Design a protein around this ligand. Sequence first.
Ligand SMILES: Cc1cc2nc3c(=O)[nH]c(=O)nc-3n(C[C@H](O)[C@H](O)[C@H](O)COP(=O)(O)OP(=O)(O)OC[C@H]3O[C@@H](n4cnc5c(N)ncnc54)[C@H](O)[C@@H]3O)c2cc1C
Ligand SMILES: Cc1cc2nc3c(=O)[nH]c(=O)nc-3n(C[C@H](O)[C@H](O)[C@H](O)COP(=O)(O)OP(=O)(O)OC[C@H]3O[C@@H](n4cnc5c(N)ncnc54)[C@H](O)[C@@H]3O)c2cc1C
Ligand SMILES: Cc1cc2nc3c(=O)[nH]c(=O)nc-3n(C[C@H](O)[C@H](O)[C@H](O)COP(=O)(O)OP(=O)(O)OC[C@H]3O[C@@H](n4cnc5c(N)ncnc54)[C@H](O)[C@@H]3O)c2cc1C
Ligand SMILES: Cc1cc2nc3c(=O)[nH]c(=O)nc-3n(C[C@H](O)[C@H](O)[C@H](O)COP(=O)(O)OP(=O)(O)OC[C@H]3O[C@@H](n4cnc5c(N)ncnc54)[C@H](O)[C@@H]3O)c2cc1C
Ligand SMILES: NCCC[C@H](N)C(=O)O
Ligand SMILES: NCCC[C@H](N)C(=O)O
Ligand SMILES: NCCC[C@H](N)C(=O)O
Lengths: 451, 451, 451, 451
Amino acid sequence: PRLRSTPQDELHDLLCVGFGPASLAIAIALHDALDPRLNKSAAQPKICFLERQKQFAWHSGMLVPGSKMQISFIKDLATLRDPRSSFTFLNYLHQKGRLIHFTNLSTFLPARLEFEDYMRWCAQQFSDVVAYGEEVVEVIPGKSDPSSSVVDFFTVRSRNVETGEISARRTRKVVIAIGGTAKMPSGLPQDPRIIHSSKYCTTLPALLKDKSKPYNIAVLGSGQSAAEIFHDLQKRYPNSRTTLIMRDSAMRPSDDSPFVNEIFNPERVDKFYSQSAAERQRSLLADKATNYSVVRLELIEEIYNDMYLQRVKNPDETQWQHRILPERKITRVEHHGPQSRMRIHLKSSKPVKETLEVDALMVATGYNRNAHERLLSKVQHLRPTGQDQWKPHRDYRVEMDPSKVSSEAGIWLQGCNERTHGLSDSLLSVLAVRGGEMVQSIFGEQLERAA
Amino acid sequence: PRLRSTPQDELHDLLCVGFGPASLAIAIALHDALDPRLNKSAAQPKICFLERQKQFAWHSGMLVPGSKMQISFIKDLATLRDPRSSFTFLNYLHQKGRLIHFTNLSTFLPARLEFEDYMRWCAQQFSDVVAYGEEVVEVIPGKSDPSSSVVDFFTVRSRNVETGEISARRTRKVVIAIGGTAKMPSGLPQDPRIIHSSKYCTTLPALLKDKSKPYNIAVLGSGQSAAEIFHDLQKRYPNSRTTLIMRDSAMRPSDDSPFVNEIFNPERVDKFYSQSAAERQRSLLADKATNYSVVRLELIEEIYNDMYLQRVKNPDETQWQHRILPERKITRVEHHGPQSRMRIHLKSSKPVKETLEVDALMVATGYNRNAHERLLSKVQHLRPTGQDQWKPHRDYRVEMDPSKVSSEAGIWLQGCNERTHGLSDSLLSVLAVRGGEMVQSIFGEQLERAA
Amino acid sequence: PRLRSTPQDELHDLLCVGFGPASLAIAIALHDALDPRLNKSAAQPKICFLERQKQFAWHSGMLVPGSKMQISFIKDLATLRDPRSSFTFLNYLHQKGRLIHFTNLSTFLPARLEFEDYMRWCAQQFSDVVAYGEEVVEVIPGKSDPSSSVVDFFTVRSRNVETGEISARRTRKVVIAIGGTAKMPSGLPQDPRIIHSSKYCTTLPALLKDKSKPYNIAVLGSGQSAAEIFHDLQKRYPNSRTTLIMRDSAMRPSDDSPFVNEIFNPERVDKFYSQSAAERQRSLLADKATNYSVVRLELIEEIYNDMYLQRVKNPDETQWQHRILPERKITRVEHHGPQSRMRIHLKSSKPVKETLEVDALMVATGYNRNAHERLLSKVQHLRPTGQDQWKPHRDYRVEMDPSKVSSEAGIWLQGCNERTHGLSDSLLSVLAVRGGEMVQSIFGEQLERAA
Amino acid sequence: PRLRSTPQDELHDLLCVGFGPASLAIAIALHDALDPRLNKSAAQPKICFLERQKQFAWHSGMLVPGSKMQISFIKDLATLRDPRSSFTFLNYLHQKGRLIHFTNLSTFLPARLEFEDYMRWCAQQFSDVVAYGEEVVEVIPGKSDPSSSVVDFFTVRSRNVETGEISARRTRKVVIAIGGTAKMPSGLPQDPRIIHSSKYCTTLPALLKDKSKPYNIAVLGSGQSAAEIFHDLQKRYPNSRTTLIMRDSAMRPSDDSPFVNEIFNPERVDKFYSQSAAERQRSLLADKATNYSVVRLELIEEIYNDMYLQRVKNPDETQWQHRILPERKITRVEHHGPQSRMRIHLKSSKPVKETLEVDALMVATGYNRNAHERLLSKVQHLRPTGQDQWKPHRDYRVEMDPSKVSSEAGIWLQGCNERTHGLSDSLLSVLAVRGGEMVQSIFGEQLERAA
Ligand SMILES: Cc1cc2nc3c(=O)[nH]c(=O)nc-3n(C[C@H](O)[C@H](O)[C@H](O)COP(=O)(O)OP(=O)(O)OC[C@H]3O[C@@H](n4cnc5c(N)ncnc54)[C@H](O)[C@@H]3O)c2cc1C
Ligand SMILES: Cc1cc2nc3c(=O)[nH]c(=O)nc-3n(C[C@H](O)[C@H](O)[C@H](O)COP(=O)(O)OP(=O)(O)OC[C@H]3O[C@@H](n4cnc5c(N)ncnc54)[C@H](O)[C@@H]3O)c2cc1C
Ligand SMILES: Cc1cc2nc3c(=O)[nH]c(=O)nc-3n(C[C@H](O)[C@H](O)[C@H](O)COP(=O)(O)OP(=O)(O)OC[C@H]3O[C@@H](n4cnc5c(N)ncnc54)[C@H](O)[C@@H]3O)c2cc1C
Ligand SMILES: Cc1cc2nc3c(=O)[nH]c(=O)nc-3n(C[C@H](O)[C@H](O)[C@H](O)COP(=O)(O)OP(=O)(O)OC[C@H]3O[C@@H](n4cnc5c(N)ncnc54)[C@H](O)[C@@H]3O)c2cc1C
Ligand SMILES: NCCC[C@H](N)C(=O)O
Ligand SMILES: NCCC[C@H](N)C(=O)O
Ligand SMILES: NCCC[C@H](N)C(=O)O
């Protein structure tokens, strides 16, 4: 099958906000559900994806040279749902003439560059139904009978990133799959020299143009992003003096041990979801080291080894080209001085220390997943009376007042539901299976008519 | 699609001798070629497989506990030809409800027990076209016009392993895929206590019945089979005294390094085949350590570690429970004595040493691949005049005198062609791709009519 | 030098309670301080060690086959203080004729069996100054002038483990290095079938005598001890049905990552000690995963793999020979029934489940380090007024009222000071350096006279 | 003890030619034999070492960034002889304040930079007895009674590398420990752009000065040196186009498997030496993959991975920045052209291909160990009549006619005796033990007088 485009003016069955991996997994699952080769029961649903980037890209600001996936390739966008799918990583390799060559690597962990290209190869097959350069700015409730008190569609308004014009599309069902936004410490001032990890590859080279210059560059944080940037900077700027600032005492290893890791299994979502709010909070805390503020062991070991080599060359740590400053917090940033370097004031992170002069501060402090709140502000009144937070059901559809919203209309959330669905929610871990679940939840009636 | 059985009395399009992995890969490729889901161009060919075992089994005498595949699961019976195939290892796992669980192991190397079950799961889907308990004993030339000098079919005669009756099936094309036979040193006498590695799991427990008894058991050889048996015996018979006898100075590691390993790539068969006899002989020798008389490093290290632990317990090697005797050869076996133990006489393997008294000698000396010669003795006269060896073309069809044999008739060899096709010939390495190549070579005309 | 014995009746310079690794490291450091070859400045101090075991043994109840050290051999009993010492692991190997052979293993982690033998080899060299089979039962204050209010020696009373007779030795200085006692859940009743991990190898075989019998054996806990026992039982009793009961959701991996692991460095003791009580408590919690309720990754992976193999054989987890039951707690133990099996009642560990019938319950719930409290009850009054807990100084000497105790008398604690000295206190990590520090603290005046 | 210098004019007991690791191990063993702390039996022997380098350096032309030892640190210059020695790698680390830090790396394989510094630290302690900048040019026989026919000393003549003046020293005993000389293919012409691997770090940067320039650089060979240079060039010159030319089909992995590796054990020298010439030749061939024309697996895998990444970026191998050209041999080098690039003509190495234009050719073709022949030309007549090759005894002393040479005079060879003493001869493997053996062989009489 081949998904054809729907004219902008027609009522859509589904409109998806964002075309990152989460939305792409839904597109793939729909294709597969409509394929007679895979689904024996298999008109076309009217679907559109809106993506603010001008083309498909996966965390392009963090495509650090040599960076690797932290998940088995088997957990791609189709395999766990159907290994026979044309959208598996192995079939992508076969199509590229690279399958035997990848096999000879004996690794489950492709370069992030390669995995992005896999997803790009998948994404390109849906170009007819994806509108790029469209930033969704609001979702507005709609009534086919404006005199009634029942909402039965939604209008999704997006802004063209190049022209700035506003387009509207109407749909019975909306999916919001917009990932996360850069989290910045509230104490830090705004400055072109202060840059979030998410914009590392895309904006730092424009600030620090000469790769041979002895720049002083600090990195704030101790998670995977902070470690990757710290390590890369030492290769990208060979004569630089880099400094890793962390409030913890040390970089800590990610837990990928097999029993613990079973929390990422697709079948575990049912189990997690059915737990109480207290139990879910308890569970997420207990398993935090699988995902948050943690670094892959291999990378920790490499950075440690690099530090040891500095010790061999010079026993005085204060003279090392690259340094780590643990149990520190930034208390003041001077950035109005005549020189191109900022002055960073540090204290102990325990409940006055040194001063650093730097050309740039990379801030690897993670992400927030609350941007859907702003997009859904105008539909908040459709929630049950007195409810001031969106409550996703197991099938990811948000709860709305049944007396206010028709059964045929709804809004689903994707990627922002860790609190209710578990640690796998924001990752690639369950995307293949979740895509299949989403297609059933959204298009079930049509698929049942064929079944 | 589903391959239906052909009545014994009808002329077959293809008859395959053996239903091990090589024949199974052909069955799978044919299924896939006939599947409209995978091949858009896709009556049924008349096909039968004859297998001497009573059911599908893969080296059952060597299904040693804990034994592992020495090849990536990606090199299964379909993936390298088509990752979308229902016969991939990953789809097998999915069907069994085990895919996520295998993923969590982070290994490319399943237990041999698991891989056999994968192949058994594949094999069971062809039960309608496989006759088990049928040992093929001869291939006889046939002439549709007996007064002419042109052969245009073959009669394949098989012996029922239970009843002993002789059945005949006629076919235009024959494939011989019968693997290897046990290679035994010519100096060794016949004795129930002298057993080839291929019969280890199936016959040794019948000889040495009490698992707690202090048996003396020797193992001859230094390849993967010898190492696996040596290591297993120490677990199976905890109180036994085992001795590894080898003519080499040491167990040597298998070469699985990535550049060298590319010799096993499916596309390399073309390159190898087109080389001269001298070059091919040279090439096979240079790369011998990838496959022959070699042990997986991990297993060498485990055995070595076990030996070290014996040293900790006792510094006198002569007192060790389990011993390795390198650079030795057996010169005499006494096995007519009144006691249940044989007397093995050893000398240096260099161009008189000790004596061992043992309850059993496991002989792990490898395999010969010449059994097709006996089966094809009655068709030898169809080869070009003066040719006293079978010459497989690139497509595995043996050369026959075109003035004696019709273009529609032929015999293909599988698994015994290392001399012409390379080190991957006897392994699982190229089976998926080779199956596809075989289906084209044998059924091409029919498939072209559909294409 | 060679430490000669002191007659029981003479006033000792030092008496050490316990001859485990901590006391042995002090003996070694004293030898080394007195050796002219190592210390250029170098009468004999009057010293005695009292050990309740009949000979040197290191956690003999947990010398599980195949069990390994969780610390580099470089952190032996001398190397970190002086690599030239005759008491290094490498010199032990050299003396045994095993150095080259160990080198060829390429491991930093010897078998626990080997490391015990290293320590036994060290211990045997101090046989003249160690009294075995002597259980210290009390430390009594002594006054050379009984009419005065100043304590200037201590009497250490011990009970002969064979004869039961009481011996007394007088000393100016005492070291208490008695390790830990078995920690048992308070809810469990006393029963010969309920056995702590510390008595696994020494007492379980006496209870379950027939190694081939299909016993049901449970294990309580999820730390290294629980994992080792769980794994071993499956080898020791091949036909048994084992069950691992844990309150956590999963076995979690030990953190041995290099930055975090620096907390075990000898120089870090100064840093840890100088922190506030609050900071120390915070620090110990943050780094808990380096030592407590954690399993070596390799062992987790092996157990996981064994579980997967059960899945291959049978997809129904309830039928598996060996099982893990996570998030469970024991609420009732029935052990008065006519059968030889106890009935264990389980519930969820979250704030009624199944029932198990077992022949034995192995309880791997860790250790307490409070036994010094009982031994020092009669000297408690020498602490500063109102102080109801022993307060070790940096040099491990407990604080006593200077107006009550002479400067030449004192009591040191070893191995029970994690709260004040850090996570390395109970381990082998800092023993070499700590031994040297202890010798200076205790014998400094004599050593200064030579210096 | 401290070895004092001998005036140039005095008769020496020993003169050693070369102060690389082999001579340094002798110096260390002598120190240790004379140390009362280690040898209880312990005037000073008159000794001098002559070294052509201006200071101690270990293969400085191949101190490639990130390069690692291929041998356990335990096989340092003392440990296998005496772990108590002050000259062990661990004691070096302790002295540098780095022991705990190295321990935390969990590696047996220090950087070559670190190991050189270890050896430099050892070497500096013998500065009084080492004359640097002295290139030995000949050994001349000497007779204390010139009218007699008996040689009883040797004169060693050396050339000052700075002034060019000739100095002579007289000695009863000589050791030649001069390592190897650069082996170059005889077909290659002399050119500043054609450089042996041994001069990579020291001379290539002087030829290719701009690290950012898009140079074309070829590497000839497929051993460890060729792989290290190939890999490093890609980092040193990021915009370069590198090409690895090899006559073999692939880089092959070094055999470091534990049983095979036992050939490097010090005790194995006795066993190897006592074999016949035929057996020794056979043995060296069988074990070639442990040392010659082989690459460490880890490095092969890294290079392979780098090649795969090029494939991801571009499926056309001809466009890759860095390429490997297997089964090739150089037949013509054009190097008289007006451009700065040479033209290299390649053919198949099998019994016309492409053309490469390159700025430099690195030639990693190994070493010869025959330079002692030139130095000993004037003493050849002292060998038994008709003997045209030097024959080292087990103790490394060359055979001389007893009627021509006094028992108190002799010449020993070190590092060039693989044919007679085995594969460990040229390596660090047996240096500690061999040093001890050499001290006994040379100074035994003096040491026996003390014993
Ligand atoms: C550097 C990095 C590496 C990672 N690597 C891994 C890994 O190895 N394995 C793993 O499982 N997880 C990984 N993750 C986790 C990651 O969250 C998932 O891989 C994945 O990106 C989640 O997909 P998503 O579609 O939910 O969110 P995203 O990938 O963020 O996609 C959301 C999309 O919505 C678009 N969008 C946002 N706002 C709007 C708007 N208003 N209108 C229109 N479009 C909009 C964005 O442009 C984006 O394309 C990584 C995360 C980071 C930051
Ligand atoms: C113990 C062991 C482990 C191995 N593991 C691996 C591995 O991990 N990876 C890998 O790539 N290679 C491995 N191999 C190599 C092995 O040769 C292939 O895996 C595979 O078995 C080859 O398949 P085949 O069909 O050519 O031969 P076989 O597997 O031997 O199958 C031939 C079949 O023909 C039947 N047969 C024989 N004679 C007759 C007759 N006269 N009439 C009818 N039927 C007959 C036999 O019963 C058998 O079923 C292993 C080999 C051994 C011995
Ligand atoms: C199974 C196990 C394995 C371990 N493995 C490691 C490892 O790999 N690495 C590591 O660093 N740590 C390990 N540890 C931590 C362990 O605590 C230390 O290795 C070490 O045992 C501490 O030595 P110690 O002398 O302080 O205590 P102990 O080893 O317990 O020694 C105390 C001694 O005092 C004796 N004693 C007790 N009471 C009396 C009395 N009243 N009178 C006389 N004598 C008495 C005891 O018999 C004992 O010999 C392990 C612990 C366990 C339980
Ligand atoms: C790049 C490289 C890396 C290696 N790494 C390892 C390793 O990891 N492990 C290992 O076991 N082996 C290794 N080797 C093997 C190596 O041969 C030994 O490590 C070691 O160098 C042998 O020591 P030697 O003293 O015999 O020879 P050399 O190290 O070559 O020392 C000989 C010395 O004699 C001097 N000399 C030469 N001619 C004269 C003269 N006419 N007069 C005066 N002085 C002279 C030289 O300047 C030199 O200092 C490596 C070899 C190379 C090339
Ligand atoms: N940060 C990525 C975590 C991936 C997870 N361990 C999984 O297997 O799904
Ligand atoms: N449980 C033993 C921990 C040992 C510690 N990682 C150390 O290196 O000292
Ligand atoms: N090329 C160095 C080889 C070192 C050798 N495997 C050894 O252990 O001595």
